[PDB]
Symmetry: C3
Subunit: 442 residues, 3 copies
């Protein structure tokens, strides 16, 4: 039996933020969520999180996280900002007084720490019957106090403890130094009691790296990102420039797709196999089938079918569904609309809140204007500069003239027109502009 305490109670001062440090995000999850996902993979019997400013936070634990993870996470509060030693004391109150098992202590600002690293700590600790084991790592420039004697190779800030050793070393602890009670002092107290102080060493330094400021945040965002890219590359995805390709965790991509530079794939986006994600593409929660091209596109909450072509310069808003072999071309925007198999919207148009059938063609520079919705049939051909004033129904195989405004329904196989006929005014430019265009004409 192991109880895990996450200390998330500090102020996060040097973030210079009105957003609590621990709720700051990277690769798709907040630091706290990254911390709790790794620990939940470990599955200890008791998992407890300790808080300071607690109203914003407590809501997202358990509420959202204990559910998403399908387990209980207890929360303990820390009324006075006493320090990490006291925080640990606050977390222990949530255990039955007669609690038997080990206690592992961690923070909420190490977003890379993983279940294996935690498991190895617990394993070394039971192996040597320890009392206390402390995780460490070795660096180039130590700042990160420093490391078994004691603590001022640095200290990771992650500990396994014997509950009886811990409760006792804590009962006898002071303050004078910042003016708080550190947990590091538990190591020196148990050394006085002639206790065994063990230390599990982590070769991979970035797994236990913490975030105190926005410079360090960007660093770990960067390292985590390299590791998600390299995992996709090794499964069969070409990433031309891993330095300018941000891929969130969860995002899935398949065999032989090519990802070109300047691309972010975010949230729960999925890419099928054999795709081309061109350059400068940003997709959050977008699903793409196999053999599709998505180039210079900014899109979210949408789906793009197999062998379809989107880009360059296309904007997809929430609720867009484009069928297989479909096309959205340059300078098009689509919001909350369904577009069938094989249909093409190639240029300078906006399609909002409509449904379009299959193998239809929408002419350049058109607009769907506004609970009824416009509906357009299959094999329909609309001419350039058509405005579709909602709601309106266009039947299968219908056509529209260039420069038409559609305000009424159009039957299957009718041509809808409105533009007046062309008149030429001979020698106008000679008379109304004498100079320039006038000459030529001459």
């Amino acid at each position: 039996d192991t109880a895990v305490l996450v200390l998330a109670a500090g102020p996060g001062t040097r973030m210079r933020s009105d957003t609590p440090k621990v709720l700051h995000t990277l690769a798709g999850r907040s630091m706290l969520s990254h911390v709790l996902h790794a620990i939940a993979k470990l599955a200890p019997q008791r998992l407890i999180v300790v808080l300071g400013h607690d109203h914003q936070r407590i809501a997202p634990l358990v509420g959202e996280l204990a559910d998403t993870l399908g387990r209980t996470i207890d929360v303990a509060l820390q009324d006075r900002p006493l320090g990490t030693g006291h925080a640990v004391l606050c977390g222990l109150s949530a255990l039955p007084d007669d609690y038997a098992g080990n206690v592992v202590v961690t923070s909420g600002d190490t977003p890379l720490l993983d279940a294996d690293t935690l498991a190895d700590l617990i394993a070394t600790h039971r192996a040597v019957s320890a009392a206390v084991t402390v995780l460490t790592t070795t660096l180039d420039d130590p700042f990160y106090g420093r490391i078994v004697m004691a603590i001022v190779e640095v200290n990771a800030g992650v500990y396994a403890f014997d509950i009886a050793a811990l409760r006792s070393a804590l009962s006898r602890l002071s303050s004078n130094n910042q003016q708080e009670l550190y947990l590091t002092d538990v190591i020196a107290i148990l050394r006085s009691d002639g206790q065994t102080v063990h230390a599990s060493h982590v070769d991979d330094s970035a797994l236990v790296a913490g975030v105190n400021n926005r410079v360090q945040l960007a660093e770990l965002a960067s390292e985590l990102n390299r590791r998600v890219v390299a995992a996709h590359q090794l499964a069969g995805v070409t990433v031309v420039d891993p330095a300018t390709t941000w891929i969130d965790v969860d995002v899935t991509i398949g065999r032989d797709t090519v990802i070109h530079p300047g691309t972010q794939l975010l949230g729960r986006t999925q890419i099928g196999g054999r795709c081309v994600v061109g350059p400068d593409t940003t997709l959050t929660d977008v699903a793409v089938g196999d053999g599709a091209s998505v180039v210079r596109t900014h899109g979210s909450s949408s789906s793009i079918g197999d062998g379809a072509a989107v880009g360059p310069f296309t904007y997809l808003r929430p609720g867009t569904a484009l069928g297989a072999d479909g096309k959205l071309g340059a300078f098009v925007e689509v919001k909350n609309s369904t577009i069938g198999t094989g249909t093409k919207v190639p240029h300078l148009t906006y399609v909002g809140d409509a449904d379009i059938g299959e193998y239809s063609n929408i002419g350049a520079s058109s607009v769907f204007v506004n609970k009824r919705r416009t509906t357009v049939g299959s094999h329909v051909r609309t001419g350039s500069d058509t405005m579709f004033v909602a709601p309106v129904t266009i039947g299968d195989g219908a056509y529209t003239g260039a420069g038409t405004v559609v305000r009424e329904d159009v039957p299957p196989g009718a041509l809808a027109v409105s533009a007046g006929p062309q008149r030429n005014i001979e020698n106008w430019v000679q008379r109304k502009r004498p100079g320039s265009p006038a000459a030529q004409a001459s």
Copy 2:
């Protein structure tokens, strides 16, 4: 009393440029301007710049720089390309023959050298009563002759001197070697005269790094850029990808704003707090209020109010002012135009040389065509595909139909229309296209 000489007289051959080496830019200023800004912070009593090809240059010193800095910068010319030793001799002529104080010598191609580094040099030099002190630094791969004995840990190329020692060591100097007179030889001459040769060492190597070619230029542009980003991050700005975020010096940004990858912020741009600068945004001299979003936008000389939304795919030309809570959407361009509080230009339009009031809506795919100017009132709603042929006045709460061309004024609360009415040609496609669209209709 200290006189500072900047040697800016060499040809800059391996830049392979028709632009004088010293006028090549990074982070917003030319190398020379970066050099003179640091020295002007030092505030010596005499500041003198020595030139070779001098017509392009002399204009920007003092002219532009001595003003901007509000002090005098004397200029000395160097008629024959004799070398750095002679250049220094040329610079000394601009001093009263009976000049008392120290002489500090620097180049115009170290754009990172700062006032502190200069101050420490002067301080060490007076501390030991020196005659000559020379700045040095230590590197991985020395190229950068090499360092107290003499000079072939490398030599920075920055010196403090006693004026009497300097004038004397210079009077006795030769040429044979390139075939010029080096200043490095002053160190070996004063060593013969048994003089004290001191040396101030700089740990931060990049402060004294110089630029001889375009590979080194990009390097220092890169290093300076990391340091401007990290300063913003530590003040409370999230930069998701510091490697692809170019921020010029002077640019100011505020608390809790988020800057997404592929963004350049240039010239005297200002970002308020709580903003989102999405990805792929380039802004030169643009001012943005608090809580505004600016995503995939290319803009200059413009202002965007509080809580406004611009992007993705928007182009702002000089003289654009957008009020608070305003909106410019995808595929819009705006030049020299004022747009009031709460007004929205959401799609595929161009607005040139107009003024628009508050809480108005401009319909998709419209154009403001051309000393009079078009003026549009508040709470106005224009329909899609409207062309506003300047000059024209649209009164408050007026409307426009889809596909209207406005050539005349529209009173408060009138609807302006021009499009003809819709006609349907039944069974047209059967007759004019037998095959395809024809079937369906069937």
Copy 3:
């Protein structure tokens, strides 16, 4: 006389690809093409490539490569997947039994190896009368068996041999270990025969780096890219951000042009001198004259004349020719069209399959709709929202009204119109919308 064998017969398993490893590309050429281009520069008397899955491959050697290189490349097949030792045996069959000269052996997955490195190997080998020489290099983390005794400073995998020594050491070779015949074992066999084993060492490690997976592919793509950028920078091209500028081999760029971040220049693209390639530009096979600006543009198979301006947000499709001093502005797309000296297409238009003369102006938000082609004369001014329904001829100095649909020819100096006249409906908004826009009007 030297015969060069390229071993391109392995499966490439950890690429996780349906595209043969050796046909995977970087900087414009496949790895195999990069390998054969370097060797063809060497010009040995016999060049032979050995294959496994061979149908896709054999076609591109010689077919395409032996031609492009203007020499013969023989191909040898390897029926059973026996290993590199056997592959070499298969390659030797393509030599006359009585072959006299040296044999150099290389792979098809080292895309950086160059002719000098090959020449130095051959030179060291003849210098010491060797039998076998093996190329080596020294690394930070060896994985890359390891190096004269034998092979488990690592082994490059490139060898020079005496033909008689090689044929003999090969005749006596086994299998048990993977379960194949390695060529590394030839080194240990000739050591038994007391033969001289020489070893040419390569300081530049990246020249002999190989690609087994997509992580290593991106690495070498990155290194090759740094070296092409630095060569352009040293010839007089400013690259603001070499990390986000992909330039393919062959691409040429000239003096004093500036390349801004996020730019790929691909295929056989050429940039003249004094240009500005803004940020976020992607050009494949595009030719640009001197003094032109190309900003936020995605283009291919096209040409842009001297002092012309394209961008931001412009899309060029194959067959676009734009003359000198021409302009394509924001949100324009052009396919297979010719546009003369001095003509401007500034906003929100599409131009497909047309020819346009000189000093013409095309008004915002227009479309060229479809063997005849539309033709537009010089000094022509078309108004906004004009649809040109192909085919149609517009004569020199002709004009068009705003919101015109052109279906018929327009003579030199005529004005073409079609839009109806403007009508205002007074007090419409009071009656049809009581609330909001209604008030004002009040």
